[PDB]
């Protein structure tokens, strides 16, 4: 079946807990596979040790820039960037996992977890999974953001990987 993966997240060096994500490989296999492999680190790089660098309350929590840690970087397991696979899944509500980008066909490693329905992103960002467990952790992360996206605590993915 679809992969289940996890992010264990600290805020200011203390654990918040675990976010478990289902990756919809049935719908977006290329996009799911990228994220899965970046969680395991099996290609020699990935999310371990990287941060949630941009967090906006009542919108989303963004992470995955493991090269520049500021929203300008990251890379996929395929090369620096890869195409939008499809827009079949929609940003339906809190818990949606979706690819950040810099315009059409610029997926890399950055992603975000929505804390509200973000319908205006439909057809622009590739949705590829959702939170199975750990929305409490997501809400904590969310509570450390700001209108500008600047975080008030250092939010680190200390560990990550594949469950199934
Ligand atoms: N994948 C992704 C998501 C958000 C921003 C970016 C991005 N911004 O600047 C650059 C320099 Cl190449 N990349 C890339």
Q: What's the gap in Å between 136 CA and the centre of ligand 1?
A: 28
For residues 56 and 49, give the distance between their C-alpha atoms in angstroms, rounded to a whole number.
21
Q: How far is CA 101 from CA 4, 15, 153, in A?
A: 23, 28, 24
Structure-token match 């904590």, residue found? 140
Please provide the DSSP assignment of the chain as one string.
---EEEEEEEETTEEEEEEEEEE-TTT-HHHHHHHHHHHHTTTS--STT-BEEEEETTTEEEE--TTTSSSS----SSSS-B------S---STTEEEE--SSTT-BSS-EEEESS--GGGTTTS-EEEEEEE-HHHHHHHHHT--TTS--SS-EEEEEEEE--
Of the residues 23, 66, 101, 128, which is catalytic? Answer: 101
> What are the CA-CA distances from residue 23 to residues 79, 103, 134 (Å)?
20, 22, 15
- 36, 54, 91, 130: which one is catalytic? 54
Look up 4 and say whether it is catalytic.
Answer: no
Q: How far is CA 1 from the centre of its chain?
A: 20
Ligand 1 centroid – CA 107 distance (Å): 8
Q: Is position 125 annotated as part of the catalytic site?
A: yes
Distance 79 CA to ligand 1 centre (A): 13
The answer to whether 109 touches 98, Cβ cutoff 8 Å, is no
Rama region for 17: left / alpha / beta (φ>0; ψ in -120 to 50; rest): left
Nearest of 142, 135, 151, 162 to residue 19 by alpha carbon: 135
**Resolution of the coordinates in A?**
1.5
Angstrom distance (rounded) from CA 80 to CA 5: 22
Q: Catalytic site residue 110? A: no
- Cα torsion through 122, 127, 132, 135, rounded to 10: -60
The phi-psi region of residue 131 (left if phi > 0; otherwise alpha if psi is between -120 and 50; otherwise beta) is: beta
- Distance between Cα 76 and ligand 1 center (Å): 11
Nearest to 45 by CA among 92, 78, 83, 85: 78
* Best probe residue, ligand 1, of 34, 38, 60, 71 (max atoms within 8 Å of C-beta): 71
Domains by residue range for the chain, with CATH: 1-164 (2.40.100.10)
Closest CA to 151 of 35, 63, 20, 38: 63
């Amino acid at each position: 079946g679809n992969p289940l993966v996890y992010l264990d997240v600290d805020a200011n060096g203390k654990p918040l807990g675990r976010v478990v994500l289902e990756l919809k490989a049935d719908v977006v296999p290329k996009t799911a596979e990228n994220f899965r492999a970046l969680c395991t680190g099996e290609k020699g790089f990935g999310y371990k040790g990287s941060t949630f660098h941009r967090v906006i309350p009542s919108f989303m929590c963004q992470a995955g820039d493991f090269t520049n840690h500021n929203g300008t970087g990251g890379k996929s397991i395929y090369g620096s960037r890869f195409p939008d696979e499809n827009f079949t899944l929609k940003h339906v509500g809190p818990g949606v996992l979706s690819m950040a980008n810099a315009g059409p066909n610029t997926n890399g490693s950055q992603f975000f977890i929505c804390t509200i329905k973000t319908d205006w992103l439909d057809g622009k960002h590739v949705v590829f999974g959702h939170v199975i467990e750990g929305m409490d952790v997501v809400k904590k992360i969310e509570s450390f953001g700001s209108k500008s996206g600047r975080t008030s605590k250092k939010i680190v993915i200390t560990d990550c990987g594949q469950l199934s």
